[PDB]
């Protein structure tokens with residue numbers, strides 16, 4: 040792809056092991072990142088430091104974009120490598136140069152920002168309006184329609200744990216496991232420890 | 240500034256009265272808006288019509304931007320006029336030509352998307368981390384720090400209805416009543432009718 044190849048030619052790319060923290064909330068934002076390979080979680084915390092997963096991001100996703108457009112912003116969340124990752128980086132200052140050369144690279148970034156706003160808005164509604172079963176059900180549907188979901192003969196395979204679902208919907212891992220058992224009994228899913236199949 | 244004035248010169252300007260809906264969730268998105276004057280509320284809804292305010296947007300804000308970057312999308316929320324509004328409107332197709340001539344106009348729009356993502360993400364953490372009591376406590380603390388809060392001898396007085404609290408925190412007006420009474424019992428606020436005093 041020529042636009043993304045040109046862009047990456049102006050970055051420097053680095054390897055990070057699984058569980059590396061790429062971005063820390065509250066740091067000064069001066070750098071944009073782009074996932075060449077691997078997956079990350081975007082995390083926020085409560086007052087006791089307890090984590091919740093705000094999003095997962097994958098190969099082809101920009102990260103660290105939110106301070107690009109205004110001076111002196113701070114990182115809004117933590118970003119942690121869930122797998123080993125290969126991440127391109129570029130300063131905000133150089134990226135702003137690229138945008139004046141070819142605004143298509145800003146369109147590619149902004150498209151992802153717009154998607155994230157859509158997804159995060161929907162999460163506000165799920166948290167505001169739905170009971171725990173309904174939040175879990177939506178979370179499974181959403182994971183199943185991700186590009187990384189694998190098609191099986193009986194449905195979509197997703198890679199997630201009860202603790203991760205809990206950290207998405209705001210309940211305990213035990214509560215998630217009870218609800219997954221209900222959804223299994225209803226013949227809607229098959230739930231293992233690290234994998235769930237959503238039947239279809 | 241010259242970028243904004245250049246942009247507006249390519250738009251069709253129109254007026255909405257207070258309480259009108261500018262954008263309905265689920266409609267096909269083909270047009271970008273920009274608020275020249277007035278203010279709007281961005282909301283989402285229950286199946287049962289329960290509402291939650293995602294944001295207020297004001298003069299200078301783009302609206303209807305989320306469908307710009309891929310064809311075939313639907314509007315993600317309702318946008319309703321909180322006051323009479325004058326709004327500039329441009330097709331996505333035309334606006335994409337503008338971006339190529341001067342991408343500063345996209346920087347302006349993407350700057351607002353970034354702020355909205357930060358604000359909405361904070362709302363997700365509040366909803367997920369806090370029970371309805373904690374959400375109300377925190378909403379009252381926040382309102383007490385706003386300019387419309389009235390400093391009194393006993394603390395900061397706010398004027399807000401149970402209804403209005405519910406469409407911030409995600410609970411019904413009756414639930415709001417119960418929590419406020421509990422908080423009062425704990426000698427943290429006084430709460431009666433639409434008048435709250437935060438000690």
Ligand SMILES: Nc1ncnc2c1ncn2[C@@H]1O[C@@H]2COP(=O)(O)O[C@H]2[C@H]1O
Nearest residue numbers: 094102103104105106114115116155159
């Ligand atoms: N709601 C969200 N959805 C997806 N990614 C997010 C969200 N909130 C923050 N991030 C990412 O987490 C990064 C933290 O650093 P920045 O705020 O610079 O840029 C942020 C985004 O890349």
Ligand SMILES: Nc1ncnc2c1ncn2[C@@H]1O[C@@H]2COP(=O)(O)O[C@H]2[C@H]1O
Nearest residue numbers: 294302303304305306314315316355359
């Ligand atoms: N979380 C949010 N914060 C502020 N504005 C929003 C949010 N979600 C949706 N919008 C606005 O509401 C509009 C509804 O139509 P669009 O999805 O085209 O574009 C959307 C944005 O302009």
Ligand SMILES: Nc1ncnc2c1ncn2[C@@H]1O[C@@H]2COP(=O)(O)O[C@H]2[C@H]1O
Nearest residue numbers: 167168289290402405406409410411412
């Ligand atoms: N989960 C919820 N339960 C009830 N009302 C809600 C919820 N989330 C948002 N709301 C809105 O908050 C409002 C509070 O006042 P009402 O109960 O009259 O109407 C309510 C709804 O419009």
